[PDB]
Design a protein around this ligand. Sequence first.
Ligand SMILES: CNc1cnn(C)c(=O)c1Cl
Length: 106
Amino acid sequence: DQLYSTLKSILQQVKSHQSAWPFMEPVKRTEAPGYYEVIRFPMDLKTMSERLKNRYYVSKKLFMADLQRVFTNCKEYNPPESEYYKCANILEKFFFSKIKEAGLID
Ligand SMILES: CNc1cnn(C)c(=O)c1Cl
């Protein structure tokens, strides 16, 4: 399947990015005590990798939703000038450039 191959490529490029490090695994409670009382829909790149493997991403829309959720969680939780927020905006720019380069559409 060509969608799977394209999404796998985009996701791995995102994961290899220097600004992806905060988003690689679920936020640990020890890193942010009470995070899971605040953030209703946690998401991270490890979870997305498994979802990709399990053939969840049958559309661009589903893939976009999860990656975008990584960023919105980060911006909802963290101050605008925090390193985490800064990484989210850098990685989001990159993400959208990868979507465009792949020609990924609905
Ligand atoms: C390691 N990533 C983390 C850690 N703490 N918080 C609050 C975050 O939002 C993220 Cl992405």
